[PDB]
Design a protein around this nucleic acid. Sequence first.
DNA 1: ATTATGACGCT
Length: 425
Amino acid sequence: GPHMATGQDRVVALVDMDCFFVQVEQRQNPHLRNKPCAVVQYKSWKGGGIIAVSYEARAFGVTRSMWADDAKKLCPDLLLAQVRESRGKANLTKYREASVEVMEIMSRFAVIERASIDEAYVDLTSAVQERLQKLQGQPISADLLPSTYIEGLPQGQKEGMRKQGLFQWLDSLQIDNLTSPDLQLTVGAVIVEEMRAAIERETGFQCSAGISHNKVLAKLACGLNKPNRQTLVSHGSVPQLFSQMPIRKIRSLGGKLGASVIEILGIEYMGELTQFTESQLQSHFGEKNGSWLYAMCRGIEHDPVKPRQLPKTIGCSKNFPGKTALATREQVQWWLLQLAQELEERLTKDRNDNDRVATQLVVSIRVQGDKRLSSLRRCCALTRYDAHKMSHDAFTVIKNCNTSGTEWSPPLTMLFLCATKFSAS
DNA sequence: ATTATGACGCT
Ligand SMILES: [Mn+2]
Ligand SMILES: [Mn+2]
């Protein structure tokens, strides 16, 4: 009872830009705004691979990782923006720079953890305490929450439902207790409305967000009401929400581990996990995963919001699938040079912007017919930002994979260069 | 012949 900690100490938000690459292209080209549109990479093979889809296009069934020619069968009016191509590969620079715009606005409100190019976690605990003291007892007006959904409410037209749920929540709120978790989540949501307003004002970009007590719940909440909306998942809403929540929807359970939870335990939903002791879970899934599952199914997770706005590694990758696989020495060299040239550009810009130097080069390759996604990964020293030297070293480091007797065999279906091990400069 | 990345765990 009194000693079971309930993981309500923090207020954590997950902000995710709605169809981010598409919005970047729609800001740049107004003809695309408020239309079915998608962003593609390459164009020759089946019109190119789609990597981002507006919500209007999604209503027709267009999805990521779908060929553009097939998407056009579902949505003949679909509009397409193409990723920039440089040195024969996709260049994502425009989206990394748009991402930094967004991150820099978010960083004004609270400390953020860049979780991907288009999403960050926010630790709002201090911000909420400060704002609570600023209110000095004033109750929270629904006007301050114009796009917030309260998950699980109403209980007992879409916007009509939203407002009813919010009204029930706010009427139930105990504004005089500055230590109530539910009040703290609520103030966190007010701040997140303000953050999302500043992002849209200063970039034109819309986003969704989740507000809860930890990263996993914030992330799960963010996806409940998209696009352009935010969802508050309270501690108290977890039993009902998790009672029908497929295990695969929880972050890190979408793959093999989640499938083995399902197969070994004979269950489907997150909430069923409550029935197992911690020791049982550790026995099946190992001590770390067991403790984590035992707490997570009760809505409790302790992973911190790391103060990290910048990526930890800077990487350059290209697949050479099918008959385009690289089969000669000249080919492997020239593409290592193209990759190393993009890497040099991004690294020099990174050193100037962020006062740091990478010190290790990671070279990863895939050979044709190899089952694995990395057929090999080897590291060497990264001592100067020179594309010719980095390409020469990556070669030097992979070349004993060639089994020919100027040819290259097995042909290579992927090259990958990654600068890592950053040190302040 | 989804592709381009990027974080993190295991050993
Ligand atoms: Mn997104
Ligand atoms: Mn995202």
